[PDB]
Write a protein that binds this ligand. Structure first.
Ligand SMILES: Nc1ncnc2c1ncn2[C@@H]1O[C@H](COP(=O)(O)OP(=O)(O)OP(=O)(O)O)[C@@H](O)[C@H]1O
Lengths: 827, 85
């Protein structure tokens, strides 16, 4: 009766939201320069309305007395929708092109990189019969990728018969690009080629016929969306030895679409600190950098933030010298402090923010929110990608309608797409075999931070800014920072997410239970233990509590039916409440082994990754429950006290799952009496690690064969003895990028390290970048250099008794960078 | 009789399943629409477990392909409107 109308209004509401997101995605494509300002006001309002409507829908869906308030909110939200509708109806050249015409004798540091590039493509010009090859140059924003190409072009030009410098935009017109290529080749025969409009085809044929029996060196720069370039490639398809191509792009994933070989892809790096200092002083100062002596420290600090981008340095140098160091120690501090909050809103600096925002506008949808989510975290720190992915999934930015996806691999794809688009620097490798953490450039950071503050996406509280937007009623995301002063909490009822960064101001001054709705709650790095009110929260999806001094967890947490993640690492809790099996949806569960897991985990069927499961004092039904839930991807094992046929039971129980890709078992000073040689492994595995070293295997497992688990790229294996046939058996494994084997008997007993011999096969190492051998003598002369084309490091034991022997006749340079190696020699 | 190319077939299958023209129950798929309310045409196939018939009241047509699961799990008589059977 009463509920029927609200149920039949919810679908109308969701359809309305779909149209609203459609139009919002449409308007956000064009840059805010060709967009009339009235439409911008309207779009902002429609965004706020979308927030309100989606909050209503989520409230209803989680809740189902509340029907009365929900219905009232429904009709009034319909009221604002209509009112805004009639209120709206009532009223109705490339910045980086000029940089190309810059003086040659102003570039600093071009010659070394330019000479390296010329000899890495012109090395075959001597005996100019090598087939044509292409060189891609990859970078982000402005790192002279275009300038360097022109510097190389202007030097080696007299030794080719043709040549053209042609550019491609974000959305090229293919006819224009090909006409430009034609016009540059000969300006006399094809003088008015831009007037003639034949088709995409006949002019490609014109190029092909014109490029008969010549060496050209055509350079094509700023290629986005490789689908564009695969049309140009058909212009260069006839064999033409002695001719080459140069390609530049800000998208690394389109470079392997070129030249088909990693050796030709030219990653290029920022300037060094010395060269950056020289360029910075050359623009501002007259002739000597030692004259001021008092803003030198400010100079190096401000130079550190740019890092090595000739762009940021050039813009800062211009802005900081209006007329000979207009002022010192005050405006330089102003520019140091203005990074992060407001430096972008300035003068003659906009000419470089367009060049940066090209990338951001190039993104598809569903990636703009993910990129903007970076504005939450502080300036200079590493962000763990797992935290990003889980926060994204809980926020709602990751979804699809394909049902063959787990929703986490999708987030990883989004992260990788952001990485390859040259917007995040990935560093480190975590235990999952993927990127550990990530960081963003400062000017990209403050740029997107201002862009987010332009709408109500994110609210940031800093001492340098000390500004709080005029409308406190409508705030969704809040990120508290070192500011522990303005902690107002009055008028945030619909509060989307909240986080605290290394601040004791949490708890004592700020209250959380006031927030009726709250999607995520991130609090890692605090030292507060009063969390018992989470039962009152109902829509909470993320609960991060890593290293938070929380003593105990409230029992009534089982009501939190909608939940996704639960991080409890680094805490002092030791027991989990029993009402955790009542909870239904989870995908990750970060629990240290010191904690005790109550029985009933078989209820949690949706689990996708479980970390550091401590198996101590467990009975068999609980052991076999683990194979019931067939959705885990990553699992971690450590134990000390059930080494029985219980081990065999769970050893065959793990095979019941088929979604695994990484595993590891931890046990100290013990043989692995769990794995039997007769057991099929999961069809998918990637890591299969074994962190403990005081444990061992009697023999190498037989089930590790090239037949099964052929996708391995990680071993971390240890065993008691060693046989010269195990290495040959292991080499036939397809990828095995990473290897690590330990000889327990050698480093525990008086065992003379023998020399295993590679009998069968020829190379056995198509790509094994890292190979580590402990307690095993691996001379570099297991095979000639054509065995492991990719091998950067090698570790082995070398007895001193083989120094006078003839079997260690090494000294040759193998194919990869096999020149920095130290061996622990034993007398 | 007539025969259809295989990839044209599944191409048509996706092109028709993007809207609610027809609905297919297959073991390799085990994929169902979240809008269990709006289903018009049913094509039951080798799948004989996911034979749900809760909320399909606007059923234009049904078909069964050499499956003994017909009837014993699914009821036809409840479909108030039916074009073809
Ligand atoms: N090594 C350098 N020394 C001095 N100035 C430089 C150097 N490299 C680039 N610049 C200046 O910085 C800007 C670099 O332009 P760049 O060639 O980076 O564009 P790009 O690499 O194609 O990047 P984008 O993706 O922005 O087009 C230009 O103003 C250029 O003159």
């Amino acid at each position: 009766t009463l509920e029927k109308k609200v149920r039949k209004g919810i679908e109308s509401l969701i359809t309305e939201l779909k149209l609203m997101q459609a139009v919002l995605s449409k308007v956000s494509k064009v840059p805010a320069d060709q967009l009339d300002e009235g439409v911008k006001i309207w779009a902002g309002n429609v965004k706020e309305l979308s927030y309100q409507m989606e909050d209503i829908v989520d409230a209803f869906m989680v809740r189902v007395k509340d029907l009365h308030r929900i219905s009232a909110a429904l009709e009034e939200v319909v009221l604002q929708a209509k009112q805004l509708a009639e209120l709206r109806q009532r009223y109705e050249v490339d910045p980086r092109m000029m940089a190309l015409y810059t003086d040659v004798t102003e570039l600093v540091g071009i010659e070394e990189t330019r000479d390296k590039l010329i000899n890495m493509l012109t090395e075959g010009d001597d005996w100019s019969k090598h087939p044509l090859k292409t060189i891609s140059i990859v970078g982000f924003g402005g790192l002279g990728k275009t300038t360097l190409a022109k510097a190389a072009y202007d030097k080696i030009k007299v030794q080719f018969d043709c040549g053209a410098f042609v550019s491609v935009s974000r959305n090229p017109e293919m006819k224009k690009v090909l006409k430009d290529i034609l016009y540059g080749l000969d300006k006399v025969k094809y003088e008015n080629i831009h007037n003639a409009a034949r088709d995409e085809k006949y002019l490609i044929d014109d190029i092909i016929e014109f490029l008969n029996d010549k060496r050209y060196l055509i350079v094509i720069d700023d290629i986005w969306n490789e689908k564009a370039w695969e049309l140009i490639k058909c212009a260069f398809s006839k064999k033409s030895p002695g001719s080459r191509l140069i390609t530049t792009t800000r998208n690394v994933s389109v470079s392997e679409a070129c030249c088909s070989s990693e050796d030709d892809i030219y990653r290029m790096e920022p300037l060094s600190n010395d060269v950056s200092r020289t360029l910075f002083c050359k623009r501002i100062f007259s002739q000597e950098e030692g004259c001021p002596q008092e803003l030198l420290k400010v100079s190096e600090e401000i130079l550190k933030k740019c890092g090595g981008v000739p762009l940021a340095i050039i813009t800062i140098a211009s802005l900081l010298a209006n007329k000979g160091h207009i002022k010192a120690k005050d405006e330089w501090y102003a520019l140091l402090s203005s990074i992060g909050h407001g430096l972008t809103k300035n003068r003659s600096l906009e000419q470089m923010k367009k060049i940066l925002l090209f990338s951001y506008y190039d993104l598809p949808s569903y990636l703009k929110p993910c990129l903007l989510y970076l504005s939450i975290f502080p300036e200079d720190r590493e962000i763990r990608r797992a935290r990003l992915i889980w926060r994204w999934i809980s926020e709602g930015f990751v979804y699809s309608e394909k049902q063959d996806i787990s929703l986490y691999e999708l987030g990883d794809s989004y992260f990788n797409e952001l990485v390859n688009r040259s917007m995040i620097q990935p560093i480190g490798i975590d235990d999952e075999g993927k990127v550990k953490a990530c960081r963003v450039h400062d000017m990209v950071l403050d740029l997107i931070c201002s862009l987010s503050s332009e709408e109500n996406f994110v609210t940031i509280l800093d001492d340098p800014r000390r500004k709080m937007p005029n409308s406190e009623s409508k705030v969704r995301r809040l990120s508290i920072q070192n500011s522990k002063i303005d902690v107002d909490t009055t008028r945030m009822e619909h509060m989307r997410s909240v986080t605290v960064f290394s601040d004791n101001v949490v708890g004592k001054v700020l209250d959380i239970s006031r927030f009726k709705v709250l999607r995520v709650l991130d609090l890692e790095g605090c030292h507060v233990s009063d969390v018992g009110y989470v039962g009152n929260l109902l829509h909470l999806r993320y609960l991060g509590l890593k290293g938070t001094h929380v003593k105990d967890l409230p029992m009534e947490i089982g009501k939190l039916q909608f939940l996704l993640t639960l991080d409890l690492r680094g805490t002092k809790i030791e027991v989990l409440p029993w009402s955790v099996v009542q909870l239904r949806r989870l995908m990750c569960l970060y629990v240290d082994y010191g904690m005790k897991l109550p029985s009933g985990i078989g209820n949690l069927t949706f689990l996708e990754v479980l970390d550091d499961l401590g198996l101590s004092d467990v009975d068999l039904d609980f052991v076999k429950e683990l194979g019931r839930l067939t959705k885990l991807r990553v699992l971690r094992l450590d134990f000390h006290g059930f080494d029985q046929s219980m081990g065999k039971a769970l050893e065959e129980s793990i095979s019941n799952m088929y979604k695994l890709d990484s595993l590891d078992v931890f046990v100290n000073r013990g043989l692995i009496n769990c794995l039997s040689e007769h057991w099929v492994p999961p069809p998918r595995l990637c890591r299969l690690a074994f962190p403990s070293k005081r444990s061992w295997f009697k023999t190498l497992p037989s089930w590790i064969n090239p037949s099964s688990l052929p996708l391995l790229s990680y071993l971390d294996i240890t065993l008691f003895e060693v046989r010269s046939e195990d290495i040959q058996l292991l080499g036939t494994l397809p990828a095995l990028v990473y290897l690590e084997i330990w000889n327990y008997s050698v480093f525990e007993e008086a065992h003379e390290v023998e020399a295993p011999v590679l009998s069968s096969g020829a190379a056995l190492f198509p790509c094994a970048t890292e190979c580590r051998f402990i307690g095993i003598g691996a001379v570099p002369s297991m095979f000639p250099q054509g065995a492991a084309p990719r091998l950067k490091r090698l570790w082995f034991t070398f007895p001193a008794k083989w120094i006078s022997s003839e079997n260690i006749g090494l000294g040759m340079r193998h194919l990869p960078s096999l020149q920095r190696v130290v061996v622990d020699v034993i007398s």
